[PDB]
Design a protein around this ligand. Structure first.
Ligand SMILES: [Zn+2]
Ligand SMILES: [Zn+2]
Lengths: 306, 306
């Protein structure tokens, strides 16, 4: 019973030539939450140029109606009051704080001491809770963090367990992990803090994202991040359509995603995003489906060919 | 030091709407063997409607020139003399016999006894050797064979070690294996016959082909199959561009493939095949590449951006 977090609207928004209109975000958000039944959705980044603020507001206005405002999440930053104010205004109720997960990143971008930066973090989490939000924390560049500066990473997670947050995200930001490493890194933290909710968020640079995601599931993770058609910044995020199918058929864990809405979700973001998918795209490609040669992956299973 | 076998021209040819012209096959074959430096290439299937015969003949005529006729392989069938005659005529020197690797397949398609069919196999291998060819053997549907009728599979491999063949191919024909299973199946055969040359040939139905391919490398395999842009019949074959890169960076094994020709190879088959690749395609996609955020996968590394 794993949670699936769709990042299509935000991380996917980062893709070159992709910019969703308010109507586009509302439509896509509604479909993912209601039809695909994705647990939560990360719709945007805070302090993006207003308008983006208006979009979130409209989506929040709607979400209120359907009794599911707690399912919407907003990428935020360590900037004191600015991020939390913007989200307070947006109407959104959940954060997803972007923190540096590698000693290398912390220094080349902030130039602060682990304790120095951990202070800025505690303040934003504090102020957010004070402002009525809930917080999820990204350990940006963690895939390089636990392999190069595992100390810095262990203290950050240590410090985070003291804060009142919902989940910790372990992203392979630069998509460099092999399934082995993904299992190592995740296992390293799940064993130390067996009562925390960690989620894996891989990137597909080596076409290992769904594989990595499977190892993360073995190492203990309780949730996973992904995007429709693997939309995203480089090679994109873990491809949602292939992740879910693989989880359902190649693992003993499950998901609440309704497979039958998978095909429409794909066509949906492809059109609105303006990024074409190849005809051989796993599970969702046009040419994908075409009883001696029976493959568990059938067209009607994903709302196609009938 | 693994061997890479490109199946782009044959298995890839099977893709819907794809039919390579003679000039197209010659061009693509030349590039893969000479510039990408792929060990061998599987250019076609025997008894395909003549013309296909002419193509192979021209490619063989050329291959002779460059002193590398032994690097070209032709998918063949268990049909007595027909396949071996066609390849004898083609000028090609290597077979790659398609045999049923699952008891289920053997019966629903031939209706013969393991011993009955093993006789047809020994004759074709015999006749091929008699005709000056070398033989590689595909255990079609093996991914379902070692999991459902492992007995039938063990006898077939047993029988094959008695024949004078070059290699045994372990294909995940329907692309249903998880990396775990791929490691199990491959390990099952490599341990019994430690002196045989097995190669994995996975399909990308679950977007696990390159991951599976990595496990196959651990289980003992000495060679791997793949196609440019994952061209192929469904989701296609293991994507060559991602396989090689992953092998080089995420495994201690190596390859003779020249990474710098990877980008041109992709553009090459994309254009000639008429099958577009998404802009976020790992390693080869248009948008893929775009020093705080340094990813080992650099554009100039694959003959791009300079
Ligand atoms: Zn990301
Ligand atoms: Zn195949």
């Amino acid at each position: 019973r794993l949670e699936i977090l769709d990042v299509t609207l935000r991380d996917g928004e980062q893709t070159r030539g992709v910019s969703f209109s308010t109507s586009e975000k509302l439509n896509i958000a509604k479909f993912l939450l209601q039809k695909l039944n994705v647990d939560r959705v990360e719709i945007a980044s805070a302090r993006v140029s207003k308008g983006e603020l208006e979009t979130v507001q409209k989506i929040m206005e709607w979400a209120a109606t359907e009794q599911l405002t707690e399912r919407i999440e907003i990428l935020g930053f360590v900037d004191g009051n600015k991020t939390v104010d913007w989200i307070k205004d947006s109407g959104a109720k959940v954060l997803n704080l972007l923190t540096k997960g590698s000693l290398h990143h912390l220094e080349k971008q902030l130039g602060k001491t682990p304790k120095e930066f951990f202070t800025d973090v505690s303040f934003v989490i504090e102020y957010a809770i004070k402002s009525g939000l809930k917080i999820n924390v990204y350990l940006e560049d963690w895939s390089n963090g636990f392999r190069n500066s595992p100390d810095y990473v262990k203290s950050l997670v240590e410090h985070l367990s003291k804060e009142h947050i919902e989940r910790i995200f372990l992203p392979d930001t630069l998509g460099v992990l092999s399934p082995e490493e993904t299992f190592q890194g995740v296992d390293s933290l799940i064993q130390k803090y067996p009562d925390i909710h960690f989620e894996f968020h891989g990137h597909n640079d080596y076409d290992l994202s769904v594989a990595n995601s499977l190892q993360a599931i073995r190492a203990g993770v309780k949730g996973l991040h992904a995007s429709i058609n693997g939309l995203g910044e480089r090679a994109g995020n873990t491809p949602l359509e292939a992740l879910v199918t693989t989880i359902h058929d190649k693992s003993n864990s499950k998901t609440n995603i309704n497979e039958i809405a998978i095909t429409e979700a794909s066509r949906l973001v492809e059109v609105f995003s303006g990024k074409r998918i190849s005809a051989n795209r796993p599970i969702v490609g046009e040419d994908v489906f075409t009883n001696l040669y029976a493959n568990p992956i059938l067209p009607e299973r994903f709302g196609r060919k009938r």
